[PDB]
Design a protein around this ligand. Structure first.
Ligand SMILES: CC1(C)[C@@H](O[C@H]2O[C@H](C(=O)O)[C@@H](O)[C@H](O)[C@H]2O)CC[C@]2(C)[C@H]3C(=O)C=C4[C@@H]5C[C@@](C)(C(=O)O)CC[C@]5(C)CC[C@@]4(C)[C@]3(C)CC[C@@H]12
Ligand SMILES: CC1(C)[C@@H](O[C@H]2O[C@H](C(=O)O)[C@@H](O)[C@H](O)[C@H]2O)CC[C@]2(C)[C@H]3C(=O)C=C4[C@@H]5C[C@@](C)(C(=O)O)CC[C@]5(C)CC[C@@]4(C)[C@]3(C)CC[C@@H]12
Lengths: 583, 583
């Protein structure tokens, strides 16, 4: 259902705070959800659990963990319907109401919930256990594989993506209420015809006893259009368009109305009116060419891992404005909903991406014993959930289906083909892409024609023609010539950068130095400006972030333009110089 | 010839200073050495040239470079014989006297010289040009291979060892004089009978008209013994032995005496009376069991590359005493002669190693198109030169023939077999070893039985069972159990460590972190003390040093226990605690 909010007809209780916490063990205490959890450990809830406790065993845990607390259902919610929702459980979440299992959810970055109305009475207290598993298989969405170390028998988790596999309840948890007759979902699609905006709306409600009313109210509070019935099309004369650096949001009020025109339910949905179209080599927002600038990001901060953080979000956006970035990509999984809402308000453009990284074992990637049909089912599901949650965001401008898949290999085409079709059928208003890895050159890639925009990740400077920028430059523009020659589509570089340690400086060409980072980005830009077909540049990455451990990762990925704590490297100042002065 | 010194009969002029410097190029000036060099560039000589100039083209240069200066032979040197000597030219040096080639030397780390007596008159000035080439082939001592980048034509140098291929005149240059009848070489060998010390000596001198006297003088200037003739045996009653941690050096004056008892030539040779023996599993110095503590090192400092530096030498030795290290290994090439002399006086023990690192392409490494018989000729030459130079140092206790050869492969035994014998045949006073890489396990290695002591380099914690210390413990232990049950020899660990950035800290098990470094060294020690056959532990590395450019090297190699500028990481304090509280 829709993201809960408080209305005149709905109440909303945060369940954030400290919960009791335990790992699964191998004792008789199988089934921790059947009684009061016995632990001194408390884990804060919007957070990944891994780095919270300064304990290796928790950090390295493979398998299930348990969060628990008591909840009291407000006494005045008899006569109403009520749910427990996890905005996200990374990767597999189970909800229990006193020992009854009431939801079982497999994706790691989208919402799930359970209607507990008939299990617990208003004003009753219950024990809420939420079990979350972190295990990845070749069928989970980021896929991976658990192994056992021979000598010690320690379980270990392998996977093919960079960022660390933080787990837990990294986003907030809620108790909320709706009326018996309630709104469940709303879809809004926005076109523009001259100066007139139009909203195609569709409301889905638990009942059609009593009817649906809509009002559309502008930023000044004046009702600018009205409509009746669950589905319809509204015109808005002289619209204020939502624009890439000037957000404008109307506010769509969907209500359920009884025989007496008495409101029995209501929901307020923020709406930006704007259009995305791809025309040849151009990416058009409101019929005008747009050029992405900004980053691929990560949900990653010092202690709470991937947990949502209001402050770092608002700061992160301020830093985007400060350097004149107009966009980012939700690199390698959907971010928290609040980020998308905030982007809507900040006038920031978003490439919104599924959790589908790691579909590459370079052993044939797309085969029965690796990334097969059952993985595609999970991928299809990821696509549906992402789209079902983020479809109404004006800031969301395109769907990214995957990141660095092995789109050069046999089987890749048979695997991906249905997916861009599924997306476009779920949401026909946005174009679809994926992020292409170096191995799938314009010659070798077998999947690119099935997409509306091409996104490329490239590290010519760093990984291959190492510190040889003149060699990287030639190879970069060879590759881009190939792509422009072969496809009539917009090109966005979604990765390009260099690991860089704050304070490490050199007047020579030296990788891992701030000078090198600047020089490489600056070369890439020179090359970008040589190609009419370029529609965007998003540096990798906004900020240093944590990775699986490895002799080649210096306490994480240090390709950030800011440090993990958001201090700017020289690179940051270079981008600021370029993005505040370019078109 | 012997390392030149000033005596009553010999003069010695330093030619260190700034020299004019030029890269070779494709100009109508093939042949720089034939006229005054045209450059504004001056390179200081005891220095590698690569980082001096803050210029990428000089640094990345592949091939020849030219140093030049004017030199004046003293007017008072008529009636004498005189030479120009390079202590070292990395890797291939040529000496030119006004356009005449007079020396052509091929290894990068040993002396060469030319007698110019008849080409330049006393009191004459001449133009001294020394050409030095950096190119590594599969036949050079560190071997390597030059390649050409496809798009640009940049000439580039590949090789298989870590440390950066610094080139140039990294050690001092000299003009010196010797009488017509002179001492060319001395060999001293030292045994003990009870409390009497016995010096076996042999003097090689240019002629025999008039004879050889020898005097042995103690640290007090008291002549303690004498002898006549170009070779013989000197008896020293109640000898002051040379000991690890308590140097004592006698001073052996070889003279040439004419028909009158008038001195014609004299040379003063520092000697320490000491024996080295391997009996089963023990390493014995003066019939007392010995345990190595310290480091593999590198000649490497911030701007002068491999340039010898007195301050860093004295300081580095001071840091060794501070942490109670008693030894180091001349990791990957012979060090400056002056370091060996200083080790003699400091009572520091030395594993002295040839430049033969990188004999490993893991394609078969020991074949005609890789390490082949001509390569083995170069290797044999390197062994001869090293032994010829460092034969008289009591500090030097064992020759290391190579570092990380692929001694697990077919052909490796046929390649190395002659090499231990050659060393033992040139110098029968010391054991011979080599440093064994992880591929070459106790099972797989096929070379180890030809050596007197086994040295192992092992990185279980860092490179293989990464951050998994218990897993590394088990595999380290297994391995060592394999070597001890298979050979009756001393086992010295010569590499073990982890990249560690100063300042990077963590309460968790975190590679590259100061805490991790300590946790790993500490564990390795725990395993060492379980095995009676261990004869030494030498950490890799003493200090952070520069390497070739690469995404897995953070502006060089950071496995130092000290920083490049010699600041202690947490690990330095751990070793200090360990080595000062045990023998
Ligand atoms: C690592 C990935 C998957 C890709 O994404 C990465 O982004 C960031 C990073 O690189 O640091 C991090 O977020 C994280 O590490 C990853 O998600 C970056 C590109 C990537 C490293 C590819 C390459 O860079 C280049 C490769 C070349 C291609 C080719 C044709 C060549 O250049 O000659 C063959 C050789 C080689 C090394 C094959 C591997 C890839 C495709 C590589 C390393 C794969 C992984 C990519
Ligand atoms: C790099 C060397 C030659 C060795 O010496 C180096 O020490 C330091 C360093 O590693 O950075 C520096 O001083 C410098 O770079 C070198 O002198 C260190 C060990 C070394 C890296 C080996 C390993 O660490 C482990 C390897 C494993 C072992 C293997 C084959 C097995 O026996 O089962 C499994 C796979 C692998 C990766 C094969 C390579 C080696 C033997 C490796 C990397 C070889 C190079 C070694």
């Amino acid at each position: 259902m829709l993201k809960p909010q408080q209305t005149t007809t709905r109440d909303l209780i945060s369940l954030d705070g400290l919960w009791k916490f335990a790992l699964a063990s191998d004792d008789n205490n199988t089934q921790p959800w059947t009684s009061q959890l016995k632990t001194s450990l408390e884990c804060p809830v919007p957070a990944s659990y891994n780095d919270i406790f300064a304990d290796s065993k928790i950090h390295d845990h493979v398998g299930w963990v348990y969060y628990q607390r008591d909840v009291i259902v407000p006494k005045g919610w008899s006569e109403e319907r009520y749910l427990v929702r996890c905005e996200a459980a990374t990767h597999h979440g189970r909800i229990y109401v006193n020992g009854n299992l009431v939801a079982d959810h497999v994706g790691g970055y989208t919402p799930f919930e359970a209607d507990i109305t008939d299990l617990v009475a208003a004003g009753e207290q219950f024990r809420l256990t939420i079990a979350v598993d972190n295990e990845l298989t070749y069928q989970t969405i980021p896929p991976g594989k658990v192994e056992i170390l021979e000598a010690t028998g320690k379980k270990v988790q392998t996977y093919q993506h960079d960022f660390y596999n933080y787990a837990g309840l990294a986003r907030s948890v809620w108790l909320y209420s709706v009326p018996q007759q309630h709104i469940q979902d709303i879809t809004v699609r926005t076109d523009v015809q001259g100066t007139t905006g139009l909203i195609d709306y569709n409301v889905v409600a638990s009942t059609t006893q009593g009817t649906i009313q809509v009002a559309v109210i502008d930023e000044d509070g004046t009702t600018v259009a009205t409509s009746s019935g669950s589905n319809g099309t509204i015109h808005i004369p002289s619209v204020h368009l939502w624009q890439p650096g000037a957000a404008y949001l109307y506010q769509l009020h969907a209500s359920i109305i009884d025989s007496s025109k008495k409101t029995i339910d209501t929901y307020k949905l923020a709406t930006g009116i704007r259009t995305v179209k791809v025309q040849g080599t151009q990416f058009l927002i409101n019929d005008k060419p747009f050029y992405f600038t900004g980053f691929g990001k990560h949900e990653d901060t010092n202690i709470r891992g991937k947990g949502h953080d209001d402050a770092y979000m608002v700061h992160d956006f301020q830093l985007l404005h400060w350097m004149g970035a107009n966009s980012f990509r939700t690199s390698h999984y959907p971010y928290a909903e609040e980020v998308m809402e905030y982007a809507d308000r900040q006038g920031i453009v978003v490439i919104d991406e599924t959790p589908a990284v790691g579909l590459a074992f370079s052993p044939a990637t797309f085969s029965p014993d690796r990334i097969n049909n059952k993985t595609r089912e999970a991928h299809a599901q990821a696509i549906r959930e992402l789209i079902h949650r983020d479809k109404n965001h004006p800031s969301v401008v395109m769907w990214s289906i995957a990141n660095d898949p092995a789109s050069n290999e046999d089987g890749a085409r048979e695997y991906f083909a249905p997916l861009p079709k599924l997306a476009r059928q779920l949401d026909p208003t946005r174009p679809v892409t994926f992020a292409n890895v170096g191995l799938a050159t314009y010659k070798a890639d077998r999947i690119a024609d099935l997409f509306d925009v091409l996104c490329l990740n490239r590290y010519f400077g760093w990984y291959t023609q190492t510190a040889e920028l003149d060699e990287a430059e030639a190879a970069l523009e060879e590759e881009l010539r190939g792509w422009t020659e072969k496809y009539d589509k917009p090109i966005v570089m979604t990765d390009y950068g260099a690991d860089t340690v704050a304070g490490l400086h050199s007047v020579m060409v030296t990788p891992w130095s701030e000078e090198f980072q600047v020089e490489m980005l600056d070369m890439y830009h020179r090359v970008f400006d040589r190609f009419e077909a370029m529609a965007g540049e998003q540096v990798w990455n906004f900020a240093d972030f944590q990775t699986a451990v490895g002799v080649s990762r210096v306490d994480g990925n240090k390709k950030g333009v800011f440090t993990r704590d958001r201090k700017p490297k020289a690179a940051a100042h270079l981008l600021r110089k370029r993005w505040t002065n370019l078109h």
